[PDB]
Design a protein around this nucleic acid. Sequence first.
DNA 1: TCCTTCGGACATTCAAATCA
DNA 2: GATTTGAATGTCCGAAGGAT
Length: 58
Amino acid sequence: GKVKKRLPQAKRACAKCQKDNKKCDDARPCQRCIKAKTDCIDLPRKKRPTGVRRGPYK
DNA sequence: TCCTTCGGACATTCAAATCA
DNA sequence: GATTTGAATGTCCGAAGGAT
Ligand SMILES: [Zn+2]
Ligand SMILES: [Zn+2]
């Protein structure tokens, strides 16, 4: 029954953290961009459209 | 040793589907 | 209308190999 627990996620990951698959944080610039001395950039998330059927549930 | 890369486990998003 | 479902979507651990 290995379902490991994680610490709270960053609310949103900046572009560099998304690309690196590394942990972001909630301040801007994030810690990883502070360390790299690079610009910390937020990108838009995909928004689910309405009208897409799923089929019956259980 | 530090840094970069990344497969896939852990977690979130939210309209559809279902309930009441 | 209110609550539940669950695939799409998002986050980032931990391992491997490269860089310094
Ligand atoms: Zn970040
Ligand atoms: Zn950043």
